[PDB]
Amino acid sequence: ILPDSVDWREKGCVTEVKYQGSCGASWAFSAVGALEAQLKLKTGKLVSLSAQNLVDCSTEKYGNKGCNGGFMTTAFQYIIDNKGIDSDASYPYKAMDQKCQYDSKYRAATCSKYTELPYGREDVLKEAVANKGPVSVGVDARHPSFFLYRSGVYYEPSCTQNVNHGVLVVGYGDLNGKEYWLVKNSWGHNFGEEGYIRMARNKGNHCGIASFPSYPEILQ
Ligand SMILES: CC(C)=CC(=O)NCc1cc(-c2nn(CCCN3CCOCC3)c3c2CN(C(=O)CC2CCN(C(=O)OC(C)(C)C)CC2)CC3)ccc1C(F)(F)F
Numbered sequence: 001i002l003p004d005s006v007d008w009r010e011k012g013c014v015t016e017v018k019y020q021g022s023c024g025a026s027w028a029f030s031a032v033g034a035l036e037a038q039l040k041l042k043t044g045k046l047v048s049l050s051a052q053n054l055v056d057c058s059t060e061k062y063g064n065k066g067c068n069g070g071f072m073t074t075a076f077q078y079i080i081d082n083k084g085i086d087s088d089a090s091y092p093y094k095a096m097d098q099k100c101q102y103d104s105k106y107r108a109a110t111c112s113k114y115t116e117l118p119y120g121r122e123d124v125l126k127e128a129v130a131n132k133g134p135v136s137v138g139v140d141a142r143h144p145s146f147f148l149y150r151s152g153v154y155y156e157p158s159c160t161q162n163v164n165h166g167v168l169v170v171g172y173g174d175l176n177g178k179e180y181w182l183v184k185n186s187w188g189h190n191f192g193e194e195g196y197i198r199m200a201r202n203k204g205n206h207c208g209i210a211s212f213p214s215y216p217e218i219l220q
Contacts, residue, residue: 002130005173007182013037013047013133014170015194018150021066023095027055029186030136030166031075033214035085037170039109040219050091057100061072066097072136072166076216077112104216106208112219116212120161120205125181125213135215138163139183139199140167140207149192150192153178155200161208169209172201179207 008014017038018029021188030052055066056080064070075102079085090106095128115134117124140160141147144186171182180198189195200206 002126006130006171007173008037008129008134008170011040011219012046013040014168014184015046017184018048018051019188020093020186020189021072021095021166021201021202022056023093023097024069025051025055025067025093026186027064027070027072028052028058028075030138030168031079032088033168033170033184034072034134034136034214035076035079035109035111035194035216035218038216041133041150042218048088049109049161050086050088050093051104052088052093052098053086053091053100056098057082057102058219060193064214065093070166072202073114073212073214076111076214078108079216080113084108084110111216114214114216116214117210119211122202122210125169125210125218126201127154128213128215129172132157132215132217134168134184135213137169137209137213138184138211139165139166139167139209142166146197149197151193153180153198155198155203159207161211163208163211168212170196173198179203183209 026111062074084107179201
């Protein structure tokens with residue numbers, strides 16, 4: 001039986017919240033965020049991986065369009081194919097499309113595989129968050145209430161299951177009888193609760209949080 005509440009920040013597995021700015025790279029930030037947690041678990045080191053590396057390099061071949069959108073799964077596929085991803089320190093985020101300047105000399109992580117979860121199964125997402133670590137998910141963030149969110153458990157009656165914003169589910173919980181998903185965003189500290197939003201859990205795949213989940217792994 002799973003833990004009632006999970007918060008991977010308490011295990012030192014989550015990097016600082018990032019700020020994507022006018023570049024639509026949330027897919028890239030969700031992908032590194034998931035891989036940072038696996039890297040921490042394996043090596044004991046928490047390091048920001050280069051979202052910019054994904055923006056500039058995981059491009060046409062992976063169905064991604066850099067600052068105009070992308071997918072976490074094919075981002076993971078690029079890191080597998082590329083046999084590494086640079087540290088964010090060595091490949092900083094500039095919030096625009098650049099030439100791919102990946103440099104294996106500054107490889108901070110690798111990716112062995114990635115696993116996708118079934119559409120809509122919040123129970124399965126719960127299990128994956130408890131047993132594997134933070135999970136990359138899309139959410140429907142095209143709502144003013146989302147941008148304007150400050151605290152508490154978010155619920156948007158007009159939310160759809162059609163995701164359009166990549167985020168990181170770093171845990172789950174319960175606040176005053178309202179179940180939520182603990183979601184790491186890429187809009188800086190001033191969005192929501194220190195850059196995090198707690199979104200309704202077990203409310204029929206609210207905002208599509210469980211539409212398209214996936215997490216990577218770094219194998220021995
Ligand atoms: C480049 C761009 C701009 C990308 C983008 O958008 N990224 C957002 C996003 C998409 C998906 C996602 N992954 N996958 C599966 C992988 C597909 N491939 C990826 C690359 O190659 C390998 C496989 C789907 C979706 C979105 N998706 C839906 O939501 C379902 C549809 C329901 C209703 N619609 C419909 O009927 O569409 C018609 C009308 C026919 C056009 C529209 C949407 C369709 C299927 C998952 C996560 C994210 C997020 F980044 F946010 F995290």
